[PDB]
């Protein structure tokens with residue numbers, strides 16, 4: 001048996017930020033749509049549409065992009081509702097970007113984040129998507145089986 005979801009969590013509001021210059025807006029959109037679909041059919045409640053469309057940014061502006069997009073997306077929500085997930089597309093080799101991203105999301109924004117490498121965005125295999133869905137589920141409070 002492969003791992004599966006026991007309890008699916010809920011992602012009603014999410015956004016995507018892209019840091020890869022190899023990824024156009026539409027590919028970020030398509031990738032997120034496939035991931036959202038996998039999360040759903042695996043047992044999550046998962047909004048097929050993001051709060052805002054994907055934005056592309058330079059790694060050098062990680063702090064400003066995250067804080068700005070967080071603000072803009074949150075302000076679009078019904079009062080008191082919050083962003084459940086940030087999906088980040090990252091270059092395969094990204095140096096300090098991953099750690100900067102995680103520090104900002106964990107300790108300043110308080111937002112769950114899921115990083116996805118460019119190599120997987122181009123491939124977009126079902127097995128990858130299923131694995132990432134499992135990771136997202138745990139992060140938002142769901143529960144998965146053990147092997």
Ligand SMILES: Nc1ncnc2c1ncn2[C@@H]1O[C@H](COP(=O)(O)O)[C@@H](O)[C@H]1O
Nearest residue numbers: 090094095098099113114115116117135
């Ligand atoms: N510096 C890094 N440390 C760990 N994982 C990384 C790093 N840069 C990119 N990744 C990718 O981050 C993915 C998981 O992201 P996340 O669950 O949000 O921690 C893995 O598939 C890694 O290949």
